Amino acid sequence: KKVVLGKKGDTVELTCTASQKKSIQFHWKNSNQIKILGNQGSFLTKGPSKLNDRADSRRSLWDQGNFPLIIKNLKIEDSDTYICEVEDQKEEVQLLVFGLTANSDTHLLQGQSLTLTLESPPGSSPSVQCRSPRGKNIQGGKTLSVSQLELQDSGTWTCTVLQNQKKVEFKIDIVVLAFQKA
């Protein structure tokens, strides 16, 4: 149904709103019937979920019918279809967690090849496209490559990932040096 995107090692808020603006009974679980967290009595409980530590909600917003799921330090394999269950509601949200790295270590050289790689989760259709500090645009799949680097490229690169109609945007600093051999 609803589809949220998120960056690696980042934070995201999955929303789940039921009617009767009040602290009623609820819980979150993933696609594999594993309780992420829920309210037992009035107190927040955390389940056997792999996310046990990095998962939390927001208590004050419970009296407003809101029951948000909050996940910090997002890893990629956290990508999944999360299910919130309230009263007789089944509100589903698919989280997809992308990441972006420069597989060329760092400190590159005029003429060398640069490659940005998109760490995507299993079973995704990402369409990336970036923008150098000049204006030129490159686009591709998991692998976007710059054949041969310039000095004008030394700066901050912006990159747009598009999943479905939603999108996330990374920025990644790259430095380029010059060299000669006489």
């Epitope: 019937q33 056997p48 792999k50």
Partner: antibody, heavy 120, light 112 residues
Framework: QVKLQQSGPELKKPGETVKISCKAS????????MHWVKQAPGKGLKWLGR????????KYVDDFMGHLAFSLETSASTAYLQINNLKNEDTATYFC?????????????WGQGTSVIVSS | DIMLTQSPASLTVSLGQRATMSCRAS??????????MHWYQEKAGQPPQLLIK???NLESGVPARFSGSGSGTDFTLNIHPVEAEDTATYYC?????????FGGGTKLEIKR
């Protein structure tokens, strides 16, 4: 106190099919994934596959296509494991078991253990 | 891929002595708070039975002489003092990521 009840032991020739059943009585069948484990004679345990008792979806690690087909009958709280192209390797003891997704128990309840014997 | 390697493959110990069995995971199966590991006991021709759940918690009934410990990639059970009925094969299982694989097992025998 729940409990998992499987089918009796089975004798099949090589190349035949066998369908062993597992029924849960004590909890709500569709609120817990069901896992299957194989233990060949004289060997140790080995995980086989989990089936989602809500969606029907199951993931398993069997060599060769087919041969391992997990299915459900929610209408009678019963999970099935079907082995299609039997072999002398398949001769083993098979267990189904629940995995507590709600609480900090684990494979908390197992099955009696079905004994498939494949030989001519 | 998550491989569990148990050592030793077999253990021989006299009554009243301490039995130590290790289980090493290829990758971490824990998250600060908890560790997703389990120990089973399977006596001669018996079904396996859960002994320790989540690395350090004794199952109901299990005698106090059993204990589990460890975190991350290294885990240990202890049986002290060993008794006659402890003759059995012991396995270890992780519930980190499907497949919930098993260790190779360790057979414990008593020296009289």
């Amino acid at each position: 106190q729940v409990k998992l009840q499987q089918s009796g032991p089975e004798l099949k020739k090589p190349g035949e099919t066998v369908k062993i059943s597992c029924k849960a009585s004590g909890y709500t069948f569709t609120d817990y994934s069901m896992h299957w484990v194989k233990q060949a004679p004289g060997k140790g345990l080995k995980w086989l596959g989990r089936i989602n008792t809500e969606t029907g979806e199951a993931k398993y690690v069997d060599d060769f296509m087919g041969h391992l087909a997990f299915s459900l009958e929610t209408s009678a709280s019963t999970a099935y494991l079907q082995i299609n192209n039997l072999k002398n390797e398949d001769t083993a003891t098979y267990f189904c078991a629940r995995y507590d997704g709600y609480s900090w128990d684990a494979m908390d309840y197992w099955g009696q253990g079905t004994s498939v014997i494949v030989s001519s | 891929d998550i491989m569990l390697t148990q050592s030793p493959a077999s253990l021989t110990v006299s009554l009243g002595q301490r039995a130590t069995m290790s289980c090493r995971a290829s990758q971490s199966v824990s998250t600060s708070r908890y560790s997703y590991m389990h120990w089973y006991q399977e006596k001669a021709g018996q079904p396996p039975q859960l002994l320790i759940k989540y690395a350090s918690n004794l199952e109901s009934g299990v005698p106090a002489r059993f204990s589990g410990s460890g975190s991350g990639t290294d885990f240990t059970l202890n049986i002290h003092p060993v008794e006659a009925e402890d003759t059995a094969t012991y396995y270890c299982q992780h519930s980190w990521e499907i497949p919930y694989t098993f260790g190779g097992g360790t057979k414990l025998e008593i020296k009289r």
